[PDB]
Ligand binder design. Structure first.
Ligand SMILES: [Hg+2]
Length: 410
């Protein structure tokens, strides 16, 4: 039997929390559609039990996957200090951590470590909001507008097809914003009725109007779909082409606000530092949360913004077959360090593990036989690669060192 030339010795997963009930529909949300928004089974803002089961499935799969890789044992609870789970303070991420632990090792007591203080934000997941560091206004404004084609108007103009598709799902022409229109002189248009302005401060960036509204609404339909509700978007969404068109507006906003390096680098710095320390061989030192690193597996429950910030900072790009949302609930950015038995050198591989939207819709359990979608990523800035296409430990460390914004370090 041919033996593997590479041995898996460390895994770090940054995962978006699972499907969560959207927030209460804003006044705007009901004005852009005559129809009423469907209510959810659980508190709004919280992880839905279905959301938990989906994450649990991924946990189940990862256990099977790491067992086959010889990193985890097929029987019993992982040894003390072998698996570590960290989560942002929100209910949805804490619960995502618990669901993943339950799937990876049922009945076992794997703690989900968070920042001691739950009422306050965790700078690990956004150092900008806790004032750990600030954004250079003028530089961010220029970089975002630049990636937009110079203006948000040209940006939206290039996506009118997707915007009209949204209007069709909302039946916008027979909506309050449209009907009670004060300019009956022009045809109803979301982009025209809600101009989008780029807002830049030291602790945050945002887009007003249609772009941000569209990004949120398309994600809600996705959530509906994934939650297994009767007819997402009032039965109006019928094929895969329509799903892609709709979410494209969501991915577009994230492209602008979360992947832009001038924002991504500062916002992902604490995560980059945690990831690098966890993947780098070292005795079980620390980083915080009362958890020791390095270890075998480190699971981090964060958000889609984190996945996009990390991709923007590490120059990782990806499209997910079967999943219209590039930063899907439960989506996992998997970092692995593999040692090459021959020269015993260290290499790092990155992947985006996810559940196809259908796998979410049908709540199909996962296993090696029926795995979730998986896309192997390539660090664009990596030069020193191995046959398998991985980046050397040193290269990756260099990539992290140059991309991190020290002033945003924890
Ligand atoms: Hg803890």
């Amino acid at each position: 039997q041919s033996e593997p030339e590479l041995k898996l010795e460390s895994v770090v997963i940054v995962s978006r929390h699972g499907v969560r009930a959207p927030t209460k529909a804003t006044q705007l949300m009901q004005d852009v559609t005559p129809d009423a928004w469907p209510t959810w089974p659980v508190k709004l803002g919280w992880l839905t039990p279905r959301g938990g089961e989906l994450i649990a499935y991924l946990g189940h799969y990862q256990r099977q996957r790491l067992v086959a890789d010889g990193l985890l044992a097929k029987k019993g609870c992982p040894q003390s200090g072998q698996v570590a789970i960290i989560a942002d303070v929100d209910e949805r991420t804490r619960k995502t951590g618990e669901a993943f632990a339950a799937g990876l090792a049922p009945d076992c007591a794997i703690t989900v470590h968070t920042q001691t203080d739950t009422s306050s934000p965790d700078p690990l997941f956004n150092p900008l909001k806790t004032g750990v560091c600030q954004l250079d206004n003028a530089n961010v404004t220029d970089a975002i507008l630049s990636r937009a084609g110079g203006s948000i108007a040209d940006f939206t103009g290039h996506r009118q097809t997707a915007f009209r598709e949204l209007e069709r799902v909302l039946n916008f022409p027979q909506s309050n914003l449209c009907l009670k229109r004060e300019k009956q002189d022009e045809s109803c248009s979301l982009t025209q009725a809600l101009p989008s302005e780029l807002k830049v401060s030291a602790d945050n960036v945002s887009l007003t109007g249609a772009v941000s509204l569209a990004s949120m609404l398309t994600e809600i339909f996705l959530l509906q779909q994934a939650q297994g509700m009767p007819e997402p978007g009032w039965g109006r969404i019928t094929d895969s082409h329509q799903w892609n068109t709709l979410l494209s507006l969501h991915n577009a906003q994230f492209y602008l606000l979360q992947r832009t390096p001038e924002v991504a680098r500062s916002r992902a710095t604490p995560l980059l530092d945690l990831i690098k320390t966890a993947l780098t061989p070292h005795p079980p030192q620390k980083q915080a949360y009362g958890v020791t690193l390095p270890t075998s597996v480190l699971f981090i429950a964060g958000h889609d913004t984190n996945l996009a910030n990390l991709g923007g900072a590490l120059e990782l790009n990806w499209t997910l077959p079967g999943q219209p949302d590039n930063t899907p609930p439960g989506g996992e950015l998997v970092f692995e360090r593999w040692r090459r038995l021959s020269d015993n050198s260290q290499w790092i591989q990155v992947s985006l593990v996810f559940q196809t939207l259908q796998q979410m819709r049908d709540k199909t359990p996962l296993s090696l036989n029926t795995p979730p979608g998986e896309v192997k990523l390539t660090l664009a800035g990596c030069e020193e690669r191995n046959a398998q296409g991985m980046c050397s430990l040193a290269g990756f460390t260099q990539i992290v060192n140059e991309a991190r914004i020290p002033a945003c370090s924890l």
